[PDB]
Amino acid sequence: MYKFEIYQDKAGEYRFRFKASNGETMFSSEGYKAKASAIHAIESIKRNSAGADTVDLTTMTA
Amino acid sequence: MYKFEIYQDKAGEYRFRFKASNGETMFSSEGYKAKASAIHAIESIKRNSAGADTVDLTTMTA
């Protein structure tokens, strides 16, 4: 199906990506701070993120 | 409760963050490419991400 793949970048930058059913990544994160911070971040997603609202701030006249 | 705030960075970098019930951000993304790509990414989350698995690659980093 899909999941959160938690890796660190060459820069030592702990991060996590999320996949899709067609076996493709749709985002990569900053990872927040560290591995412990990475899982804790993903813990937010596990709660109700599939039901969470999607607000767009960047609808700004420029 | 909590939601996805979609903004663009000073670098013109479309991205989205996710909040927590205590009114605090837990990640910021790369936003994938653009606004359309940002929402499409968040669409993956809406599906089953609250039930998605959490796999850590950086225990044996690649």
Side-chain angles (χ1 to χ4, degrees):
Chain A
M1 197 184 311
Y2 40 71
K3 51 64 166 58
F4 289 88
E5 61 179 316
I6 312 167
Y7 68 104
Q8 91 182 147
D9 181 68
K10 47 78 62 180
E13 288 193 62
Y14 294 88
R15 59 212 328 254
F16 55 93
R17 298 186 299 223
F18 184 48
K19 305 298 291 185
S21 52
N22 188 84
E24 50 172 271
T25 296
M26 37 60 67
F27 90 98
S28 186
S29 178
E30 58 167 301
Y32 199 36
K33 175 61 62 62
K35 177 192 293 294
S37 311
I39 286 70
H40 268 272
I42 302 167
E43 290 304 292
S44 283
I45 327 292
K46 311 316 306 291
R47 305 310 184 244
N48 188 268
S49 188
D53 191 54
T54 307
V55 185
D56 186 283
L57 304 178
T58 185
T59 40
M60 298 180 179
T61 52
Chain B
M1 191 184 187
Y2 42 78
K3 34 58 172 169
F4 289 93
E5 304 190 272
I6 312 167
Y7 61 93
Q8 85 194 92
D9 181 81
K10 56 81 61 182
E13 288 189 71
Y14 288 79
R15 301 163 174 186
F16 55 91
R17 70 177 70 120
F18 184 49
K19 304 297 293 185
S21 62
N22 61 275
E24 286 296 280
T25 301
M26 37 60 67
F27 90 96
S28 179
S29 61
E30 304 186 324
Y32 200 45
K33 173 59 180 175
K35 186 201 200 63
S37 312
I39 287 70
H40 270 244
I42 302 167
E43 290 180 56
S44 281
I45 327 292
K46 318 319 303 299
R47 309 305 173 166
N48 191 265
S49 187
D53 184 35
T54 306
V55 179
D56 187 285
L57 286 54
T58 182
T59 36
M60 302 185 68
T61 320

